[model samples]
Every structure is written in structure tokens, then in C-alpha cells.
Target: WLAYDWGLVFLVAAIVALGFVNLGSAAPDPVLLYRQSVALGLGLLLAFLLQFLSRRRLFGLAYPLYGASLLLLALVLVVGREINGARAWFVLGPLQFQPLELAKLGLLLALAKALEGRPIARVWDYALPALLTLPVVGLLLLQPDLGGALVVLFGVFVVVFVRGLPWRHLLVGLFALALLVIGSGGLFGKRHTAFVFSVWAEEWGFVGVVGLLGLYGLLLARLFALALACPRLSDRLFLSGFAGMLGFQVVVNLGVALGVMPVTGLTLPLFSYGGSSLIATLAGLGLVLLVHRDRYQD
Candidate 1:
């Protein structure tokens, strides 16, 4: 047996290590280096062990691992040890770990396996799988780690794309994405997209009216594409839930910008932050293992 996709794993690991080394030198934080080293080493060890597991076992273990990981994350919300400005890490004595990070591992493995062999005909065919990732992302966002959430989102993107979703669905998805983006680029863009809305909402104080009109138009477009795609109800429902969540994220970010929410040490994933996060992220090549491992198509 060729075992696991170690080549892919090594390539990613090497790249991530290189980045970690660079970050360590740039900042010269020994703690950061130590934390990063531990994470990277653990990840490599896990990847190595993963080579011994059968695809079925790997996938089968996913759910329980996911559950355990969620439980850990939930514990953080209640008794999580705060670091920087975000209460994200769990400190048992002196051993520190980010449950949210572990959740990403569970989500990615579970998704790639769950989506394996599925034909992405309608929206739900794929949307259902994508929905599985939202809860974790939602929890992390609650921790105010937008950057981590985005990284999780990127992992989801890799799985969905690997599963071969239809172009129409992607197009509609992109349009829906644009809506979410335009809704609150106010924080990111200030007046770029909101400039047009400024006349309607800011000048006239039509908060509800302006917000509804803009949201409805975007939703209507999405619905039209969904209808054309003739997606499953589950797909529609799940995507609707996702849209709602994205809306919540915008609101949360707005709250942060307005001082209603506290400023977080979060980055925007790949766009910000450059340390252990960058290192471990490359390990996302686990997606490749999922795709190639079962090449024995019966």
C-alpha cells in the first residue's frame, strides 16, 4: 500500500514551517516560537499517524472527534483561559491548546470524507455538507476570531470545490457573497459601498428600509438562481441558514467597529497574522489525502 498522501503532507508541512521560522525571526517572541513549535510538531505527528488509518475509520472517527472538539470549544466560552484580548485558548495547568483550531481539523476531515463520492447536482447536494462547517465557524466568530473563521471557511471551500459543485451554483454563491460583502464594507470600506446607501440610509435615517431593500434584492437574486438550479429543499434551507449566519457576522463586525463589541486580536486569515496559524494552516493538505486516497474507484 502507498499508505497516506505523505508527499502532499510534506510539501505543505515544509511550507508552513518555513513561514513559522520567518515569523519567529521577525518578532523574536520565544513564547510564540515555542507555541508554534508544539503545534507544528503535534500536527506532523498526527499527520504521520493518520497514514495508518483506513479511509472508513478516518471518516468514522470524525463525528466523535467533532463532538469532543466542540465540547472543548464550549468549555472555553465558559472557562476558557483568555490570551491577548480573546478568550480562545484552554489552559489545563500549563498545557495550552486552541479547541477551535482542533475543530478545524475535525471539520475538514469530516467534510472531505462526508462529501466523498457525492455528485453536486443541485445546491443542497453540496450545501448540506457545507452547512456542517457553519456551527464551528459560528462558535469561533463568537470568540471574535474572524481570521480563524475565515481559515475554516477556506477549508470548506477546498472540500466543496473538490467535490465538483456546479458552476451556476458557484456563480449564485458568489453573488450572495457579494451581498454579504456590500452589506457592511462600511467597516472595511467605510463609504465605498455604503456611499451609495448613505443617501438612502444615512441621509434619510431609513435604517430598516435601506437594509431590507438591499438584503431583499440580494436574496431575490439568490432565490432566482436557486430556483433555476432546482436545488433540494435541504440545500435551500441550509444556504438560507448560512446567509443568516453571514448576516450575523456582519452585524458582529459592525458592533466591533462601533465600540459596542470589543476589538479582537483577530486577523482576516492569510491576509493577516503570520505565525503558528500560518504554519498549521498548510497542514490543510489533508484535503488532498481525501481526494487521492480512494483512487481505487470500484
Candidate 2:
């Protein structure tokens, strides 16, 4: 009660509520909606529990959580399901999980723990962090999930850049990856989930799209504005990384939907149908709201 950001919280609830409405419009299957319902409950559960823990303690757990995420990602290599030529999901009867979803969050935690509070005095400082961050990219590329890798690359770029590392080196290194995936097959797929904006456009039309964009704009505007007030570098880094993560997904996925960008697969954050995605996303934003929960009462 004393530690909630009601503005961010309600905004999150509103976005999620509209997500269901959108989901219902795009995919009205009861079973699918039921699964999303279960995921929504579970996501809020993670968000609720996550917001209560101190960020320092959460960072303390970062390494162990990081190792666990990497291991799970590695295990997916042998036991994971291959969908659309990418081996990424772990299926268990009724529910399946995407390790990549968890990886982005965990990597940010570990990256923040390892890199925050350090002055970026020279170009050399980025070397260690670069090594640490690049492994996840390889694993992701091996999964051949170009979209996921790019999302992560964007996150890595945001945090390190916020730490004062040159954003130039970040993009230059990954630019080759864009070429790789473009030629080798990472951008060739059209996903059912990728049609989110299309269905949204079909059902709601141009005016509705503009309206939703305005809603999304306000939501994101609050996130970045709140980051300006973050007292700790870690707090700032976390929220900025989160904003980049969520914002990139929104931009890229919409581009994907409109045939305006590479057809790499990505789900529209709260609006897409993947349970793993919805749950993992709420968990990430929980960490974001946790930043707000620390200092402010509103």
C-alpha cells in the first residue's frame, strides 16, 4: 500500500485490459483466450511479488538468475521445440515457455550488476561488458531468432550506452548481424502473431490506430519521464533498458505488420498471443514499476 505507483499500475492494467479486447477481436478462440487469461494472472503474480523485493537484493540475485537463464537457454538447444525453423520454446503439455523472453530480463539484471557504478573512461572499458553481452547474442542467433537477438541487442545497447559507452560501437558490431540474418534466413518468416496491427487496423481503422498510438505514447512517455528521476544508476539503467525493450518491440512489430521492415518475428508486447511473452513482459515492467515503488508514493 505504501509502495505502489498507482499511475503506472493502472496504466499497466489499462493496457492489459485493452490487450484482451484486442486479443478477443483478433483471436476469439475460447481456448486461446483461456490460456492468455492464465498467463495474465501468472504475469501479475510475478509483477506483484517482484515489486516488493528491494532492487539491491534483486541485483544480488542477478548472477544466479543470470546463470539459470543461460542454462535454460542452453538446454533449449537439445530439448526445445522448433517452430518456424527456430528452436526456442519448451513445451509442457498445456503450457510452453520461451527462454528468450526470460533471457532479456535476466541479462539486464546481470549486465546492470556487473557494469553499473563504473565510469566509462575509455573505449577499452566496453570490452569486458561486450564479452559478457555477446554470448547471449550467439545463443540467440543459433536459435536463429533474429528478432529476439535484435531486441536483446537493443537492450544491451541501451544499458551500456547509458553507462557512457559509445553507442557507435554497439550498432557497428550488430550491423553485421543484420546482414547475416537478412541473407541466411532470419528475416524470411511471416508470423500469425505478426498480424496484430493488421487485425487492429481492420477492426479499429486508422482513427483507432492513432488512438492506440496515443495511449501507447502516454504510457511510454511516463516511463522515460520517470527514469529522469531515478536516483540510482542501476534504477535508471533498468528503466531505460526496459523502455528500449518495450519500445523496440512496439516499433519493430508494427513495422513487421505493415510490411515496412524486416519480417523478423516479434510479438506485440501486451497485445500478442504468446503466453510466455505476456508473462515475461509483465515481469519486466514489474521491475520497472519497482523502480518507481522505491522512492515515490504516487
Candidate 3:
């Protein structure tokens, strides 16, 4: 698949390498770079491994995997370590894992699996998918991780959009999202660190910020095109899932970084530091590639 989609691969690789550069500049020591390198290596290895799983196996695993992730989310609240006032991490000796990242993948896979052959004809048709995220959203807020919760919400909205919903519904959703963000104090909390965009411009200049965002925009354009072009229902579902997860992550991360949206801990995909985030993101992209591979082979 990389042979035909080399552009996508190149774009992503460039972004990841750029992240390494950012980490190097941001850190005083080489430790962050070394740790992130190991995480990137592991993430790539897992991504390659996942490509070998057949579509049937992947679809069949969605339910159980999603269930397990939900269990982990629930468990994290009990024994999770608090970092920056958010209890969203499982401290395993020296390593810290964020279950919310994995939950994004699980939620996407399960939602795709559920809606694979089903067509949406009425408002009730949207309920099941909406219900799917309710628990995850509730649990994330319990941890007081507004960013993670918003990511989940954004992913769900993407799924709903690709699945074909009315524009009015979208407007209502946007309104609701605005209310929640304001009501939850994300807006006020953001003001303190909202200078990140200005800082980037001051440090790296306007060209630097625009270039990074341009790469992101191009990648998203490609994903959206792929999703729209897919001929099969299942393939379309997989593409939509990948696009939604990645797209929302990019938007939220960049928005926060540029001070356009509320500040949160969401990392730019492939660019953020952490083993769990790097691994989960690559694995999700691997699934998207698998769908592409299978569809082309057929």
C-alpha cells in the first residue's frame, strides 16, 4: 500500500520527524528525544504487525477490544495517577499509559463495526452511536480531562457526519459543543496558556506555523478524498474511522496550539511525545492502510 500511497507515508513520516525536532528544541536534555525514539520505533513495529490481521479478524475483535478499553477507562479512575490535575494515566512502574488514547481507537473501531452494513434512515438511527460515546465521555470528565473528552466527542461527530446526517443536526451539535466547553470552564482555563501560537510565531516565525499546518491540511484532504472515493461499504467505514480520529486530533491539537480553541493536553498526532499515543495512532493508521490494501487487491 505504501508503494501506491507513498505520498501519504511521506507526509506522515515528515510530520513525525518534525515532531522529533520539536521535542529536541523544547527539551534541555537528550532524554526526551531518546525516549520518544524508542516509542516511535515500537509504534512503527506495532503498525506493521497490525497490517497482517485480516479484515474479518479486525472486525470481529472490535467489540471485545472496545469492551476491554471501557473496562480500562473505568479502572483508571480508581488507581490512575494524577498528572497536571488530570487522573487519566495508569502508572506502571516507570511507564505511564493513557487509557483515553486507546479508548479513541476502540470507540472508532466499535462504531465502524456496528454501522458497517446499516444505513441511517431516521434520527433514531443515530442514537446507538451516540450512546456508544456517552459512557466514555462521562468517564473522561470524571478524570477531569477535558481535552480527552473533547477528542472523543469530535471523533463521534466525524463518524456521524460521514455516516450522513442532516446539516441541522450538525449545527445543533456545534451549539451543544460550545455550551459544554463554556460550561465546563475549558474556555477560561485556556486563557492562561493561549499564547502558544504567539510563542510559536515569535520563536519560529509565521512560516514555521503555516508550514506545519499546511502539512496537516494536506494529509486531511487526502484522507477525506480516500473516504469519499471508497466503493465498498466496509472500506468506506474503515477510511471514515481513520480520517475522523486523525482529523479531529489534528484540529484539536492545532487549535489549542494556535490559541483558537481551549487549551488542553491533546498532542498533535505522530508529533506528540508518549509511547501510548504514538503506538495507538500508528496502529489506527495501520488499520486504514489495511483497508486500502485489501480494497486495491480485490
Candidate 4:
């Protein structure tokens, strides 16, 4: 009953509570608010259930879960719904889901398992991770979901870097990420003429934006703090990568929303409204708590 980190729970719950407040006031549509509330409830249940899964079982399931997400990513292209000029969502009866959400966690799990205690002493050590990344990124680009691709691409940055990679290479990738973020804004923004932050600023103002970014800083700090605290390489890799990926998305999304970066399609991690996104964030954090539980376990 006590094998958990109340700190993460407190932070996540606080953010979600604030999100509902944001949604409630910002969106007057009763149906919209009602559906979001439903998603939040579903997410809470998933997080609660995740605590019961053994780490060993989770490790065993990593590859299969990732594989399944990949298949769905491929499958969605052929039959998924198109919104904002991208085919990235599946419409189920009264429910909507995005495989990109599932793919993020799936990639995290698969990479954690593959990189655990493995050597990354050479550039070729990068080969395996790159190979793993290509198909996923390739598939996303096929959907032409540049924004989702960026998020996934950055996920690689955090995971591989955490797993063990050089700073020089990290810098190179970061540069590319920056360029693509801006470049895509010019490219996709023209095509879609859409964005996230200005709307946020319209409601929250600069003071609120500062507060929101501050909260994000705390979340990322806590994630790395726990990652560095872990004695196990596997757990460290998992937590570190999770922190980095989420952090990257936060920065990118904020930039897009605020007009500092090119407008692209990405969402604020905990604050964004999307059912799959909400469920996926909860699931990822729940698994982080699961990893945290094993800090002293065999």
C-alpha cells in the first residue's frame, strides 16, 4: 500500500485539477466539459491499476506492447480519420484515440529494455536505437504528422541520451530539432494556419504562462532527481528518458503556442485536451511510479 511516490501524485493531480478549471471556464460547451471529465476519470483508473503490475511483468511485455503500437501506427494510415490535414486518429463508437499517444510509451518501454546495461561506447552503438526509431518516425512522416514526428523524434533524444550517448551528438540532434520546429511552422503553419499558445495566453496572460512554465520546471526536475537517485540502470534509463521526452514536448508545445517557434501540432503534456493523450500521460506516469517502486527491489 505504501510503495509509491506521493510527490508525483500530488503534482499530477494538482495539474489536472487546474486543467479542469481551465477547461470549465474556457469551454462553455456542456458536452465538451462532460467528455473531458469522463476522460479524466478513465485516466485516474488506469494510473491506479498500473501500480499493481510487477516490474518483471512489465519488462517482459515491453517489446510486444511496442510492436503492437507500431502495427497500429501502420494500420491507422490506411483507415484513420483525417483532421488538420493529418491522418493520426482512430474514431471508435463514441470514443476517439490516437496511436501516437500509445507509441510514445511503447517506444519508451522498448528502448528501456533494449538499452538496459548495454554498451554505447561507439557511434555504431547508436545504430540499434536509430534503426528502432526509423520505422516509427518513417511511419509518422507518412501520415505527414510532422508535429507528432517531432515529439517522437525528441523522445529518441532523451531515451538514447539517457541510455548512454555523447553530448556532441545530442547537440547535433537538438539543433536539428530546433530547425525543424521553426521550419515546420513555416511549412505546416501555412498549410493549416493553426496553433496552441495564443489561445492559452488569451485566457491565462503572461503571469499565468510564467506560473505554468514554472510548474513544468518542477515536474522535470523531480523526474531527473528520481532518475539520478535510482541505483538500477534500467530504472534510471526509464525515468530519465521519460523526463526528457516530456520536457521536450513541453518546450516545443509552449514555443508553438506562444509564437516563439513555428506553429506545429503538439499538445501540452498534462494540460492538453485529448482522451488518448490524457490516458497516455497517466499511464506513463503510473509506470514511472511503478519504476520508482523498484528502486530497492531485486
Give the number of the best model, judged by TM-score. 2
Model 2, backbone clash pairs (residues 3+ apart or across chains), number: 0
> Cα RMSD (Å) between model 4 and the true structure?
5.7
Question: What are the lDDT scores of the predictions, listed in order?
Answer: 0.48, 0.77, 0.71, 0.75
Q: Write the per-residue lDDT of candidate 4 for residues 1-298, one digit (tens) a residue.
A: 5777778788888777766666655544688778878888898899889888888888888899889989999999999999878788899888788888778778878887888756555665667777777788878878777777777777777777766564356457556755753221222111122223444445666666677788888888889888888887877877887887788888877666656787666668778766677778888998898889877876
lDDT of 2 by residue, 32-149 (tens): 7898899999999988888668766777887888788788888898898888898989989877888887788888888877776565557557676677678787788788788888
TM-score of each: 0.53, 0.90, 0.85, 0.88
Candidate 1: tens digits of C-alpha lDDT, residues 1-298: 6644454344444435434433443334667567656666765565556556555565567678777877777777888866656678767775666776578767755664555444555666756655776677678767656655654565465445534553355435433433332232222212132222232233234443344344434533443343223232322222332333233334443444345644334321211133334334434334235324543432
Supply candidate 4's per-residue lDDT for 185. 23
Local error of candidate 2 at residue 96 (angstroms): 1.4
lDDT for position 150 in model 4: 73
Q: Order the candidates by lDDT, highest first — what do you get? A: 2, 4, 3, 1
Q: Model 4, residue 281: what's the lDDT?
A: 88
TM-score: model 1 vs. ground truth: 0.53
User: TM-score for model 2?
Assistant: 0.90
Candidate 1 lowest-lDDT run of ten: 185-194
Cα RMSD, each candidate: 13.3, 5.9, 6.2, 5.7
Pairs of residues clashing in candidate 3: none
